[PDB]
Amino acid sequence: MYDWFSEMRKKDPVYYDGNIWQVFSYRYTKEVLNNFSKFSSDLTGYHERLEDLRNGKIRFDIPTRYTMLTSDPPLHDELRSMSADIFSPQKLQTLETFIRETTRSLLDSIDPREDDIVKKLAVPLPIIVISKILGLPIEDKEKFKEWSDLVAFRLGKPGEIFELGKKYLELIGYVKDHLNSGTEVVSRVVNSNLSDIEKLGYIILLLIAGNETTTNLISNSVIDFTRFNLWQRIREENLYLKAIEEALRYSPPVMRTVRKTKERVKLGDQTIEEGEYVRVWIASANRDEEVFHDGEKFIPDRNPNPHLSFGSGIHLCLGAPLARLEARIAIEEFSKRFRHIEILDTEKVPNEVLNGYKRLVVRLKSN
Amino acid sequence: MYDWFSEMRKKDPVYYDGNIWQVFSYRYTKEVLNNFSKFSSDLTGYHERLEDLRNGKIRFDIPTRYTMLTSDPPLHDELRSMSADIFSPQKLQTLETFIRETTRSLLDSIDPREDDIVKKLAVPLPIIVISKILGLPIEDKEKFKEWSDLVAFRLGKPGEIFELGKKYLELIGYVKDHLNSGTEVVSRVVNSNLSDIEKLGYIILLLIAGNETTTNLISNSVIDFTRFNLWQRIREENLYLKAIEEALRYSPPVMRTVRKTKERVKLGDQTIEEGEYVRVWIASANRDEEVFHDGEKFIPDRNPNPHLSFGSGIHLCLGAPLARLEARIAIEEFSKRFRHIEILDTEKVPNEVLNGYKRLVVRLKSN
Ligand code: HEM
Numbered sequence: 134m135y136d137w138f139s140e141m142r143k144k145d146p147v148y149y150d151g152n153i154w155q156v157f158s159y160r161y162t163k164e165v166l167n168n169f170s171k172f173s174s175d176l177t178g179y180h181e182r183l184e185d186l187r188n189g190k191i192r193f194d195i196p197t198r199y200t201m202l203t204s205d206p207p208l209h210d211e212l213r214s215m216s217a218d219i220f221s222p223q224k225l226q227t228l229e230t231f232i233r234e235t236t237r238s239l240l241d242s243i244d245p246r247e248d249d250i251v252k253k254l255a256v257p258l259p260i261i262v263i264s265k266i267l268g269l270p271i272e273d274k275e276k277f278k279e280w281s282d283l284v285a286f287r288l289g290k291p292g293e294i295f296e297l298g299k300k301y302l303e304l305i306g307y308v309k310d311h312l313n314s315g316t317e318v319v320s321r322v323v324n325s326n327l328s329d330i331e332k333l334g335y336i337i338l339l340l341i342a343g344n345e346t347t348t349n350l351i352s353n354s355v356i357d358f359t360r361f362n363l364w365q366r367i368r369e370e371n372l373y374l375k376a377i378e379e380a381l382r383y384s385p386p387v388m389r390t391v392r393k394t395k396e397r398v399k400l401g402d403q404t405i406e407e408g409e410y411v412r413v414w415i416a417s418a419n420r421d422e423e424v425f426h427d428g429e430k431f432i433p434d435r436n437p438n439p440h441l442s443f444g445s446g447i448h449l450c451l452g453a454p455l456a457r458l459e460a461r462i463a464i465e466e467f468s469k470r471f472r473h474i475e476i477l478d479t480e481k482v483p484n485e486v487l488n489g490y491k492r493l494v495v496r497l498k499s500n
Numbered sequence: 501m502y503d504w505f506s507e508m509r510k511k512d513p514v515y516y517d518g519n520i521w522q523v524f525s526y527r528y529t530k531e532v533l534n535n536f537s538k539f540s541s542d543l544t545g546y547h548e549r550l551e552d553l554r555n556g557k558i559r560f561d562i563p564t565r566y567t568m569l570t571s572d573p574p575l576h577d578e579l580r581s582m583s584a585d586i587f588s589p590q591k592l593q594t595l596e597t598f599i600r601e602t603t604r605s606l607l608d609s610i611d612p613r614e615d616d617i618v619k620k621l622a623v624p625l626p627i628i629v630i631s632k633i634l635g636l637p638i639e640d641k642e643k644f645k646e647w648s649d650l651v652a653f654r655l656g657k658p659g660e661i662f663e664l665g666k667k668y669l670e671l672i673g674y675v676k677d678h679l680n681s682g683t684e685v686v687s688r689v690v691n692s693n694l695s696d697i698e699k700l701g702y703i704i705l706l707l708i709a710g711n712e713t714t715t716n717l718i719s720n721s722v723i724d725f726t727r728f729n730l731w732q733r734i735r736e737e738n739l740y741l742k743a744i745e746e747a748l749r750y751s752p753p754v755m756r757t758v759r760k761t762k763e764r765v766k767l768g769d770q771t772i773e774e775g776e777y778v779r780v781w782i783a784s785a786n787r788d789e790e791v792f793h794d795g796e797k798f799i800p801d802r803n804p805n806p807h808l809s810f811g812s813g814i815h816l817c818l819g820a821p822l823a824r825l826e827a828r829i830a831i832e833e834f835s836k837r838f839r840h841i842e843i844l845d846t847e848k849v850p851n852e853v854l855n856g857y858k859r860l861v862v863r864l865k866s867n
């Protein structure tokens with residue numbers, strides 16, 4: 134999205150729209166994210182219903198209502214502790230070869246005359262890698278993409294009421310069916326004596342929730358490097374690491390997130406009542422000129438680059454080192470295999486939270 | 501969409517993608533559009549089936565397969581000549597007050613603190629105006645919106661999709677129910693020598709086909725004038741006419757259209773065989789530096805501005821004077837009524853042909 138928020142960011146960085154509060158500046162976006170005690174993520178009934186989950190009174194419910202993402206400490210910390218080591222530097226270092234190979238195998242199926250980079254590269258790569266990490270097999274590639282979209286859409290509407298549909302029911306059945314093929318962190322979850330619903334929620338968060346966002350990081354990067362004609366400079370000056378960070382800043386896969394106030398609290402010059410929703414715009418914060426000099430310019434070797442695209446504070450994205458690594462390898466291999474990219478057509482994901490491409494059609498030259 | 505085509509437009513303006521031909525430059529796009537005898541619009545078998553339509557041997561089919569849009573001379577001219585005067589300068593001048601009064605009532609619905617101008621202004625205005633012109637009542641507002649979307653979607657996929665569907669069926673039922681209650685051009689069509697299927701197609705085309713495109717012009721205009729900070733200047737210098745022309749050039753509601761070759765033809769250095777599909781990118785043509793100097797700049801008083809957004813040649817949009825008038829009055833009244841627009845959120849229509857906004861959320865100050 135174009136940076137609409139400059140003036141808001143300047144003159145109304147904390148704004149009540151008649152329904153909720155919206156936050157546009159970096160200072161107050163970061164402040165909200167880090168102050169978990171005043172700005173709660175308990176938006177989906179998890180703390181409220183924890184007793185009835187554990188004692189079994191709730192049998193049929195939405196698993197993604199009960200994950201670490203919509204919990205506060207101590208609950209949040211108890212849950213996240215269980216998978217804190219899942220993407221450790223040592224684990225990712227050994228995985229690099231598999232990610233590079235998967236990437237190359239995906240590039241092998243691209244038709245240079247015309248092909249959809251979303252379909253051929255950006256969608257399959259995260260799905261294949263996370264399946265490998267968790268030891269949960271991809272039986273039906275189609276269903277995995279459907280699950281990835283569905284879950285991402287749902288996470289984007291916390292507290293909103295959606296009955297389980299046919300597809301989500303199939304996802305649940307898959308997870309139930311494949312528990313014991315999982316690697317260590319899946320085992321920890323199954324052996325934990327968390328409620329069944331929580332176990333489902335937790336596994337689905339790890340297996341599925343990171344796919345659509347990482348897919349969009351990859352597409353957004355291809356878009357940005359092409360738009361600003363940066364491929365040769367990225368190759369020549371080895372800017373892959375910093376260029377992915379600039380893509381994250383400039384085109385965040387997650388545009389915004391939301392909190393609910395636990396008490397009356399002051400934010401900037403505004404007083405926000407207890408129980409109010411506070412929507413925080415990562416996309417706008419990332420262009421804040423008081424933090425990012427020439428913030429409307431795409432600078433592939435920008436540094437420092439303290440963007441908020443993975444959040445900030447206790448919910449800082451658990452997947453961040455994996456998503457960074459996947460996107461860097463995807464771009465490296467893409468930049469190595471092809472030259473002279475020309476974009477033929479694009480189509481945006483129709484979503485206000487999820488920022489990415491449904492279609493990215495390109496023409497390429499080999500070598 | 502960002503001008504991706506810049507590359508193609510200069511190095512590969514006529515490109516075979518393995519499946520169809522795609523044209524990106526102004527010169528060849530306009531050449532294709534104007535050469536109907538070589539580049540046919542007959543993509544739905546209208547000419548092949550004309551005899552069996554007119555003698556009653558075809559009684560079931562998709563009505564929108566049989567309109568002037570997908571026909572060549574002489575059929576095209578027979579059809580268009582029946583409604584050539586429907587939007588005459590004299591008829592539109594008598595409609596100005598109704599359009600203005602309608603617009604003001606719509607502007608009344610906008611909550612300055614936050615509102616979606618797509619929902620409040622851009623979507624309803626064309627529907628209300630064309631219903632008035634044709635004397636066909638808007639009995640269900642939501643249904644007319646659904647029909648405007650599905651018909652627009654179908655027209656963007658000429659010759660594909662051979663199934664009807666429940667919403668389309670309700671549209672057909674609606675038209676059949678009102679065949680004899682409309683104004684003169686509706687009566688002209690209904691009492692003509694055309695087949696029943698054609699009459700249905702013709703009425704659908706006039707009543708419904710113009711809504712989504714005109715809506716997008718209004719939205720794209722609001723976007724562009726805001727993005728480039730042009731509202732004050734458009735007011736002061738009275739630039740409404742040329743500014744709307746520049747919105748059309750820069751942000752065409754119809755991105756592209758399609759033709760089929762009737763014979764082997766040369767286009768540029770390329771040789772196109774008979775029976776080939778030729779996709780013509782209005783959006784790229786409109787940025788051609790050889791025709792529009794500083795073509796990537798939005799210049800609200802650009803003149804000349806020979807954009808192709810309403811097409812070129814015998815299919816040159818019949819509704820152009822109406823769409824232009826509605827957009828002008830919408831923008832005029834909006835600019836008089838409000839100040840200090842700030843955009844809070846946008847969402848694009850997920851379509852490769854239709855260029856517009858599903859949501860355009862803004863905050864405003866009154867008078
Ligand atoms: C470019 C890709 C990604 C982006 C932009 C992204 C973004 C984010 C953001 C902004 C948050 C914090 C949300 C909040 O504060 O309310 C978050 C949390 C989280 N992310 Fe991601 N993410 C990405 C990829 C991934 C992947 C690949 C995984 C796992 C395989 C993952 C797993 C998680 C988890 C488990 C949390 C919850 C952390 C907690 O609540 O303590 N993410 N992510």
Ligand code: HEM
Pocket residue numbers: 533541568569570580630705706707709710711713714717752753754757758808809810811812814815816817818819820822823
């Ligand atoms: C900004 C709004 C509009 C745009 C950008 C637009 C664009 C176009 C284009 C590009 C064509 C030619 C397609 C081709 O050559 O294959 C066309 C044709 C046509 N338009 Fe529009 N249009 C708009 C509004 C309207 C409205 C409001 C109406 C009627 C109420 C309308 C009715 C028609 C008809 C009947 C044709 C077919 C003309 C023929 O085949 O001779 N249009 N339009």
Ligand SMILES: Fc1ccc(-c2c[nH]cn2)cc1
Pocket residue numbers: 284285286287288289290342343344346387450452486487
């Ligand atoms: F709406 C949302 C918000 C956040 C995610 C997310 C963050 N890390 C992995 N997935 C997905 C959808």
Ligand SMILES: Fc1ccc(-c2c[nH]cn2)cc1
Pocket residue numbers: 651652653654655656657709710711713754817819853854
């Ligand atoms: F895909 C398309 C193409 C053209 C139209 C159109 C042109 N004038 C009125 N409606 C609609 C949808």
